[PDB]
Amino acid sequence: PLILFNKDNNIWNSKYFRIPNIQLLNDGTILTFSDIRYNGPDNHAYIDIASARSTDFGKTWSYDIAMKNNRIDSTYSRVMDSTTVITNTGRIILIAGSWNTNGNWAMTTSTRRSDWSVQMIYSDDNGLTWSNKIDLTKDSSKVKNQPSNTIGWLGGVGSGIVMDDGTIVMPAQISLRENNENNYYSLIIYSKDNGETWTMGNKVPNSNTSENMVIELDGALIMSTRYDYSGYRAAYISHDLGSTWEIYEPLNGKVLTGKGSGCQGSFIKATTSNGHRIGLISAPKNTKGEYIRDNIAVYMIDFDDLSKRVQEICIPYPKDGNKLGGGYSCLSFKNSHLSIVYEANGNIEYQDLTPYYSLINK
Ligand SMILES: CC(=O)N[C@@H]1[C@@H](O)[C@H](O[C@@H]2O[C@H](CO)[C@H](O)[C@H](O)[C@H]2O)[C@@H](CO)O[C@H]1O
């Protein structure tokens, strides 16, 4: 499989790459992103976000640095953990978390992480160039309904979606100070003005939920989320654009994630030729446990045939992940094609999985 980002051979001399992202464009252009982890695999390090772009259905690629850290600290400055979406105008939005100090975003501080923010760039040229960074949290002009007890938040890590009427929804995660503890929860944010401003939904029902993606289904949002230490991906449904949540039984508990901490995964909607809406999820089986995150697999559910059990479609990365940082992945579906990007021993690899879609599409 093609090595999209190569720790061993890359224009930045980066030691390591993590947290890949993909969007298949309407015109067959492929756009991908990744954390450039200059010094190695650690989260709390010097990081920028790369793009790789391909006009030849992924034979060859053009690479750029799509977002730079705030350059304040040469050890700890980082923008990372990309969430993306393509608007109905075809604008491409990337939202990242920004820090410059040591220590986990959610758990290190008991008040608002002083160096923390959420930075956003957008592209109006099919991803050839990006705007300047736009700071979503410096003031209260850009995001409404942000809780006073916020420690930090960032996107869900993967892709957002667009509702019928053109509202953009991005998956998100937040850390909140609640009775002398820090608790993290998944939620969504939405923009009704092509990404210029945003409203924050409210948190899902269980804490310990973080990275996630939502699909739209007949006006509902359905979320598949990392639920740390539970051993599975949680799932919830919202009928009011993310103000309230209930447990979504068809998917809740259905994808197992093995012992230890959870792992990022992706969750996207496809409509097959027979009219059925299907969901596809990517995540490691993690049979070896903890951060090994072996066997990044693709699973499928049919929303129009709920009694049929979730099925493993294929295992694009049938290998143990690197314990220092692996397992993450991202699907993208557009115009009857299906691609995936994913971590593989410090590299990002890329595959076209369209043949698997054909098998499903029958
Ligand atoms: C459990 C342990 O011995 N050390 C942990 C960290 O590994 C863990 O952090 C996670 O580490 C993985 C490594 O593959 C990856 O870097 C994750 O992004 C990161 O969150 C942390 C969990 O809070 O606990 C430390 O003690």
Pairing state of beta strands 143-144 and 198-200?
Answer: parallel
Q: Measured from the CA of 290, which atom of ligand 1 is nearest? A: 1
Q: Which of 19, 138, 40 is nearest to 83 (CA)?
A: 19
Residues 299 and 315: beta-carbon distance below 8 Å: no
Q: Nominal resolution in Å? A: 2.2
What is the CA 279 to chain-centroid distance, rounded? 16
> Coil, strand or helix: which one is 358?
helix
Q: How far is the CA of 261 from the centre of ligand 1 (A)?
A: 9
Pocket of ligand 1, candidates 35, 259, 291: which has the most ligand atoms within 8 Å of its Cβ, to mutate?
Answer: 291
For residue 221 the two structure tokens come to 């949002």
Q: Measured from the CA of 325, which atom of ligand 1 is nearest? A: 14
Task: Supply angle C-alpha 298, 300, 306, rounded to 5.
Answer: 160
Pairing state of beta strands 198-200 and 181-191?
Answer: antiparallel
Pocket of ligand 1, candidates 104, 211, 264, 286: which has the most ligand atoms within 8 Å of its Cβ, to mutate?
Answer: 104
**Distance of alpha carbon 95 from alpha carbon 177, whole angstroms:** 23
For residue 293 the two structure tokens come to 């995150």
**Distance of alpha carbon 350 from alpha carbon 316, whole angstroms:** 9
Other C-beta atoms closer than 10 Å to the C-beta of 49 total 26
Q: How far is the CA of 227 from the centre of ligand 1 (A)?
A: 15
Residue-range domains of the chain with CATH: 2-361 (2.120.10.10)
Pocket of ligand 1, candidates 261, 320, 323: which has the most ligand atoms within 8 Å of its Cβ, to mutate?
Answer: 261
Residue type, 101: T
Residues 327 and 286: beta-carbon distance below 8 Å: yes
Technique used by the depositors: X-ray
Ligand 1 binding pocket (C-beta < 6 A) is 43, 104, 291, 323-325
Q: Measured from the CA of 322, which atom of ligand 1 is nearest? A: 14
Task: Supply angle C-alpha 213, 207, 107, rounded to 5.
Answer: 100
The protein residue whose alpha carbon is closest to atom 21 in ligand 1 is: 104
Q: How far is the CA of 104 from the centre of ligand 1 (A)?
A: 9
Give CA separation, 352 vs 213, 268, 335, 357, in Å.
21, 15, 13, 10
Pocket of ligand 1, candidates 16, 43, 229: which has the most ligand atoms within 8 Å of its Cβ, to mutate?
Answer: 43
